Structure formats: structure tokens, C-alpha cells
């Protein structure tokens, strides 16, 4: 199936761009979303976490207390292997279920570390969501509650903005009016539709 990889640095707003494609009927595969889905309230995976580490892993609303789980892994690195063994098969299975259930002309894959992990060959096209470096820092501080210095360190550990732009087939700047960004998405959607038809012929 024709696949577009959506990449971008921290704080770029990849998910708001991906949502626009989803609104146009595109199947969006996002491993971070799938990871949260497999531990949602009532899931067997969440129960396994609670039965091992305790009921404090479940908030009053039935959801995973993510900070408590991060604290457990921080104190007991051995528990990272147990968590991966529990969750990785579920994420892989749900990823494949969503792929197989798709009926859209192409798939949009949200890939956080495409350039870092050097995956810029497996998708048919690469779409980079770009913002200025200061915009990344500002948005990461707000969403994640980190210092500017922390945000700068994360940027240092990721591919450079220039590397991402260099690898991109298309660039969408997640800046300015939201309506114009949505219009930009619709323009790219048509491009991908025609490319998917070309590939199928
Ligand atoms: N156009 C925008 N203007 C302002 N804030 C935005 C915009 N688009 C997204 N955001 C915010 O920026 C933050 C990052 O967006 P999100 O889509 O969650 O990031 P991501 O790039 O998908 N993931 P990550 O690598 O972890 O940052 C969120 O708090 C969004 O609400």
C-alpha cells in the first residue's frame, strides 16, 4: 500500500497535521497512539501492570498512572524488559490490524525517528512537518513541562532541522493560520492520491 512517512522534530505538531489527513479519510498509523491504546482503562495489559506493580498504577479514573510506571522503570531497569515483552507484541499486532483494516488509497505513517533511525527508504514519500527551532522549544516546554535547557538537549539528540528538510520530499510548515495548514494538507492529499494511482497502474 502506498505509504507516506510523516516526520518532524519534537514540538513540531506532527499529530495535528496527521489529524488533518485523518479527516480526509487517510489511515494514520501512529505507534505512540497505539502504545497508549494497548494500556487503556480495562485492558489486559493495564491489568498485568497493576497486578505486578500495584494498584497505584491505576488512577481514580481507571487510566494508567504513567509517572508511577516511569518511576518503577527508573528504579528497576530490569522491569523495562518485562514491559517490552508485554507491550511490544500488542503494539505490533494492533499496527498490523490497522494496516489490514485500511481501505484508503494510501497510508500515513507517523515516524518520530525516520532520519535518526535511517528509515528514509521504506516509505514511498517523506513529508516533514517543519517549524523554527524556537517554536519547537516553546511548544515542548508548554506540552511537556520541561525547561528550555532540557528542550535544547532533546533537540541536540535528534536529527538537525536541516537534515530532516534535506531528506523530505515535501515540507509542511505547521505555522500561521490553522485553516491554511489544513488547506496545505488538502493540497498534499491530492498529490498523494495521484501518486497512489500512478503506483497502482
Ligand atoms: N499550529 C500549532 N500552533 C501551536 N501549537 C501547536 C500547533 N500544532 C501543534 N501544537 C502543539 O504543539 C505540541 C506538539 O504537537 P504534537 O502533534 O503533540 O507533537 P508531535 O510532533 O506529534 N510529537 P513530539 O515529537 O513528542 O513532540 C502540542 O501541545 C500541540 O497542541
| Cα 198 to ligand 1 centre (Å) | 32
How many whole angstroms separate alpha carbon 75 and alpha carbon 26? 41
Q: For ligand 1, is residue 133 a contact (CB within 6 Å)?
A: no
| Cα 201 to ligand 1 centre (Å) | 37
CA neighbours within 13 Å on the CB side: how many for 155?
Answer: 23
17, three cell numbers: 497535521
75, three cell numbers: 528504579
Three-state SS string over the chain comes to: CCEEEEECCCCCCHHHHHHHHHHCCCEEEEHHHHHHHCCCCCCHHHHHHHHHHCHHHECCCCCECHHHHHHHHHHCCHHHHHHHHHHHHHHHHHHHHHHHHCCCCCEEEECCCCCCCCCCCCCCEEEEEECCHHHHHHHHHHHHCCCHHHHHHHHHCCCCHHHHHHHCCEEEECCCCHHHHHHHHHHHHHHHHHHHHHHHC
Q: What is the resolution of the experimental data for this entry, in Å?
A: 1.5
Atom 3 (ligand 1) nearest CA: 175
Can you give the residue ranges of every domain in the chain?
1-201
How many whole angstroms separate alpha carbon 111 and alpha carbon 7? 5
Experimental approach: X-ray
Q: For ligand 1, is residue 105 a contact (CB within 6 Å)?
A: no
Amino acid at each position: 500500500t502506498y505509504t507516506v512517512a510523516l516526520t518532524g522534530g519534537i514540538g513540531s505538531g506532527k499529530s495535528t497535521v496527521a489529524d488533518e489527513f485523518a479527516h480526509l479519510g487517510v489511515t494514520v498509523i501512529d505507534a505512540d497512539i497505539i502504545a497508549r491504546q494497548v494500556v487503556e482503562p480495562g485492558t489486559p495489559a493495564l491489568l498485568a501492570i497493576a497486578e505486578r506493580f500495584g494498584p497505584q498504577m491505576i488512577n481514580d479514573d481507571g487510566s494508567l498512572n504513567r509517572r508511577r510506571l516511569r518511576e518503577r522503570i527508573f528504579a528497576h531497569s530490569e522491569d523495562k524488559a518485562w514491559l517490552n515483552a508485554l507491550l511490544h507484541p500488542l503494539i505490533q499486532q494492533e499496527t498490523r490490524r490497522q494496516m489490514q483494516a485500511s481501505t484508503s488509497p494510501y497510508l500515513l505513517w507517523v515516524v518520530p525517528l525516520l532520519v535518526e533511525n535511517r528509515l528514509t527508504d521504506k516509505a514511498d514519500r517523506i513529508l516533514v512537518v517543519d517549524v523554527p527551532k524556537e517554536t519547537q522549544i516553546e511548544r515542548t516546554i508548554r506540552r511537556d513541562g520541561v525547561s528550555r535547557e532540557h528542550a535544547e538537549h532533546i533537540l541536540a539528540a535528534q536529527a538537525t532541522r536541516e537534515q530532516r528538510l534535506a531528506a523530505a520530499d515535501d515540507v509542511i510548515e505547521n505555522m500561521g493560520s490553522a485553516d491554511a495548514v489544513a488547506s496545505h494538507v488538502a493540497r498534499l492529499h491530492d498529490k498523494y492520491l495521484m501518486l497512489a494511482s500512478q503506483a497502482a497502474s
